[PDB]
Write a protein that binds this DNA or RNA. Sequence first.
RNA 1: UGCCCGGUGCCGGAAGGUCAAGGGGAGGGGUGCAAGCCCCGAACCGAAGCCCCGGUGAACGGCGGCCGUAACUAUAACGGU
Length: 60
Amino acid sequence: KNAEKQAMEDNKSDIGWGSQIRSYVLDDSRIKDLRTGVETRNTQAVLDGSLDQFIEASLK
RNA sequence: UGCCCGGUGCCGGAAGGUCAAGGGGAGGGGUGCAAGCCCCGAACCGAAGCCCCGGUGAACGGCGGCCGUAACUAUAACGGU
Ligand SMILES: [Mg+2]
Ligand SMILES: [Mg+2]
Ligand SMILES: [Mg+2]
Ligand SMILES: [Mg+2]
Ligand SMILES: [Mg+2]
Ligand SMILES: [Mg+2]
Ligand SMILES: [Mg+2]
Ligand SMILES: [Mg+2]
Ligand SMILES: [Mg+2]
Ligand SMILES: [Mg+2]
Ligand SMILES: [Mg+2]
Ligand SMILES: [Mg+2]
Ligand SMILES: [Mg+2]
Ligand SMILES: [Mg+2]
């Protein structure tokens, strides 16, 4: 199991720069989910919990 | 060749506590007609030792536990007790 634990550690990573899946930029009001990728302009509405816009569209 | 002198040992301490023989003799008793003779006996004075106050490890000896915490884990330099 600890070998499987390190498999998680070694396959996640790394809360670092070149490592985004979505980019919430509050200085020009956008949240690009650079995976798919939607471009909703309601930044302070996504921070309130409107992730359906992303979840359902990113289950593909 | 580190840290611990609380326990034991040794060393130092004319204070204080306790301390035997002895000294002392408030008081009490036996007996005698009696002077007397004989026996207990409090306060108080009275050594070392012990207590007490310190020192001492190349003196006898002794030198912990639990809990949490860091770039996603592990570990814990750090903290709490
Ligand atoms: Mg110390
Ligand atoms: Mg000692
Ligand atoms: Mg000693
Ligand atoms: Mg001592
Ligand atoms: Mg002595
Ligand atoms: Mg006497
Ligand atoms: Mg006498
Ligand atoms: Mg008489
Ligand atoms: Mg006497
Ligand atoms: Mg003495
Ligand atoms: Mg002793
Ligand atoms: Mg030594
Ligand atoms: Mg000891
Ligand atoms: Mg940690």
